[PDB]
Design an enzyme around this catalytic site. Structure first.
Site, short mmCIF file in Angstrom:
data_model
loop_
_atom_site.label_atom_id
_atom_site.label_comp_id
_atom_site.label_asym_id
_atom_site.label_seq_id
_atom_site.Cartn_x
_atom_site.Cartn_y
_atom_site.Cartn_z
CG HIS A 1 -2.05 -1.04 1.08
ND1 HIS A 1 -2.76 -1.49 2.18
CD2 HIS A 1 -2.67 -1.60 0.01
CE1 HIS A 1 -3.69 -2.34 1.79
NE2 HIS A 1 -3.65 -2.42 0.48
CG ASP B 1 0.06 2.78 4.59
OD1 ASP B 1 -0.20 2.04 3.63
OD2 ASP B 1 -0.25 2.48 5.79
CG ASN C 1 -8.45 0.82 3.67
OD1 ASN C 1 -9.05 -0.13 3.15
ND2 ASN C 1 -8.17 1.98 3.05
C1 LIG Z 1 -2.80 3.73 2.10
C2 LIG Z 1 -3.83 2.76 2.62
N1 LIG Z 1 -4.52 2.26 1.47
C3 LIG Z 1 -5.29 1.17 1.58
O1 LIG Z 1 -5.45 0.63 2.70
C4 LIG Z 1 -6.03 0.86 0.18
C5 LIG Z 1 -6.09 1.79 -0.93
C6 LIG Z 1 -6.81 1.47 -2.08
C7 LIG Z 1 -7.42 0.21 -2.23
C8 LIG Z 1 -8.19 -0.20 -3.49
N2 LIG Z 1 -7.48 -1.18 -4.28
C9 LIG Z 1 -7.31 -0.71 -1.16
C10 LIG Z 1 -6.66 -0.35 0.05
C11 LIG Z 1 -4.80 3.49 3.59
C12 LIG Z 1 -5.53 4.61 3.21
C13 LIG Z 1 -6.37 5.29 4.13
C14 LIG Z 1 -6.51 4.88 5.43
C15 LIG Z 1 -5.84 3.72 5.84
C16 LIG Z 1 -5.85 2.95 7.06
C17 LIG Z 1 -6.53 3.26 8.28
C18 LIG Z 1 -5.90 3.26 9.53
C19 LIG Z 1 -6.58 3.58 10.69
C20 LIG Z 1 -7.94 3.86 10.60
C21 LIG Z 1 -8.74 4.20 11.82
N3 LIG Z 1 -8.98 5.58 12.07
C22 LIG Z 1 -10.06 6.07 11.25
C23 LIG Z 1 -10.32 7.56 11.46
O2 LIG Z 1 -10.69 7.83 12.80
C24 LIG Z 1 -9.72 7.29 13.71
C25 LIG Z 1 -9.40 5.82 13.41
N4 LIG Z 1 -8.58 3.87 9.41
C26 LIG Z 1 -7.87 3.56 8.28
C27 LIG Z 1 -4.95 1.89 6.82
C28 LIG Z 1 -4.64 0.73 7.67
O3 LIG Z 1 -5.56 0.25 8.38
O4 LIG Z 1 -3.51 0.18 7.57
N5 LIG Z 1 -4.41 1.98 5.57
C29 LIG Z 1 -4.97 3.07 4.93
ZN LIG Z 2 -1.68 0.99 6.82
ZN LIG Z 3 -2.21 -1.26 4.12
#
Ligand SMILES: C[C@H](NC(=O)c1ccc(CN)cc1)c1cccc2c(-c3ccc(CN4CCOCC4)nc3)c(C(=O)O)[nH]c12
Ligand SMILES: [Zn+2]
Ligand SMILES: [Zn+2]
Length: 232
Positions: free
Chosen positions: A87, A89, A181
């Site tokens: 991803h 990040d 996510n």
């Molecule tokens: C870069 C990463 N792209 C993917 O994942 C992705 C991208 C595209 C496609 C489609 N093909 C599939 C997957 C990502 C983006 C945004 C948030 C996150 C989060 C994340 C982390 C923590 C939280 C919780 N907070 C929400 C707000 O209020 C407080 C708590 N929400 C989301 C993660 C992760 O969980 O690692 N990665 C992300």
């Molecule tokens: Zn992440």
């Molecule tokens: Zn991820």
């Protein structure tokens, strides 16, 4: 001023470092995605008179800012980087790193997924990590493949000199309510993969999640709990 830095404390584009242990830092940056702002962590581990980087700072400009912050705060060259899944990040900023002299690495699984998704692609493949429970040494760390969790390719990183476990996005912070996510996740295997981490690193003193605050070993059980409940 010494507390772990949080999302509303870091403008998108600046990076802060946090000393975890002797020769171990986390890096924290913020990025927008789908119209919301999120923090994310990575790791820096001293490797003699060089540094090993774990994960980008989530974007090209953030990663350039990371390198500048490292030069300001630490002053040793980053020579190698490992991305712990595909991803943005984790890999967004790899092209910045590669142009700054950093050799970039990821598992073959991560490299394939990054290519297919249109994300930046680390240069070098990390073999020896394809089966759950596999571990390899990489400079001052051990890389461990726990099985599918947040993603099918997620790696975790242990720093044996400091008993620091960097869980990446397979591990959530204690305030988490939700599994984050989960679009690429395996909710059914995730607890089993966390149990593998727990079994393999029982002496971990600090556990660092992919996003949010470090803590201790309880982050592992909390993650299992939240993922099982989410699935339910
Ligand atoms: C870069 C990463 N792209 C993917 O994942 C992705 C991208 C595209 C496609 C489609 N093909 C599939 C997957 C990502 C983006 C945004 C948030 C996150 C989060 C994340 C982390 C923590 C939280 C919780 N907070 C929400 C707000 O209020 C407080 C708590 N929400 C989301 C993660 C992760 O969980 O690692 N990665 C992300
Ligand atoms: Zn992440
Ligand atoms: Zn991820």
């Amino acid at each position: 001023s010494g507390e772990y830095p949080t999302v509303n404390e870091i403008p998108v584009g600046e990076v802060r470092l946090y000393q975890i242990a002797d020769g171990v830092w986390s890096h924290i940056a913020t990025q927008s995605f789908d119209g919301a702002v999120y923090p994310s962590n990575g790791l820096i581990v001293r490797d003699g008179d060089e540094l090993l980087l774990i994960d980008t700072a989530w974007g090209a400009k953030n990663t350039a800012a990371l390198l500048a912050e490292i030069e300001k705060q630490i002053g040793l060259p980053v020579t190698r980087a490992v991305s712990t899944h595909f991803h943005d990040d984790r890999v967004g900023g790899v092209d910045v790193l590669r142009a700054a002299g950093v050799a970039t690495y990821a598992s073959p699984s991560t490299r394939r997924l990054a290519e297919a998704e249109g994300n930046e692609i680390p240069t070098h493949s990390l073999e020896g990590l394809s089966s759950s429970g596999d571990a390899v040494r990489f400079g001052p760390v051990e890389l461990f493949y726990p099985g599918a969790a947040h993603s099918t390719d997620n790696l975790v990183v242990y720093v044996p000199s400091a008993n620091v476990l960097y869980g990446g996005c397979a591990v959530h912070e204690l305030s988490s309510t939700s599994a984050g996510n989960v679009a690429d996740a395996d909710l059914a295997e995730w607890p089993t993969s966390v149990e593998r981490i727990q079994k393999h690193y029982p002496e971990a003193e600090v556990v660092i999640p992919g996003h949010g605050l470090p803590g201790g070993l309880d982050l592992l059980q909390h993650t299992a709990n939240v993922v099982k409940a989410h699935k339910n």
